[PDB]
């Protein structure tokens, strides 16, 4: 009984007030040196969509 609500799920991503799961761009922790500041600047945020629906099912109980 009672859903478990995923910790990682909330821990890295957010669904904006629209049922739209939005958070993180991937790939910067080992990049660098030959990295143009262009992409470090574009390593700001991301958006995500589609399977993020299932990702909305993940968080459940608290939403967040």
């Amino acid at each position: 009984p009672k859903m478990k609500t995923h910790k990682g799920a909330k821990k890295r991503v957010k669904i904006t007030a629209s049922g739209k799961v939005v958070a993180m761009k991937t790939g910067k922790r080992h990049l660098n040196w030959q990295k143009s500041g262009k992409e470090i600047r574009q390593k700001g945020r991301k958006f995500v969509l589609a399977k993020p629906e299932a990702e909305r099912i993940k968080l459940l109980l608290p939403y967040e």
């Binding site: 909330k10 821990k11 890295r12 991503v13 958070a23 993180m24 991937t26 922790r29 991301k46 995500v48």
Partner: protein, 97 residues
Amino acid sequence: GRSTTLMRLPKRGMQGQVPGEIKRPRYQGVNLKDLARFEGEVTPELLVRAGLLKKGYRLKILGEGEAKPLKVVAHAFSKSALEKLKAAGGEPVLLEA
């Protein structure tokens, strides 16, 4: 099989510890177009006894709408909220003083 799209990375910041987390007072937002609809005065318990707050620690006045004269009992204040209480309205603060 892959990183179950788990390859997205965390940036929830601070996000947990072990001495629990800090209780430190939070603010409930109030839009003063909900002001004009209500009448008399406003107070913390009054909103918790209403349907527009309940134990949200404290209360921050804010919002848009029509400014109408009366008094509130506020815990926090937006710059904008100070302005509709410049149309003809009063406000106290923090209490216990």
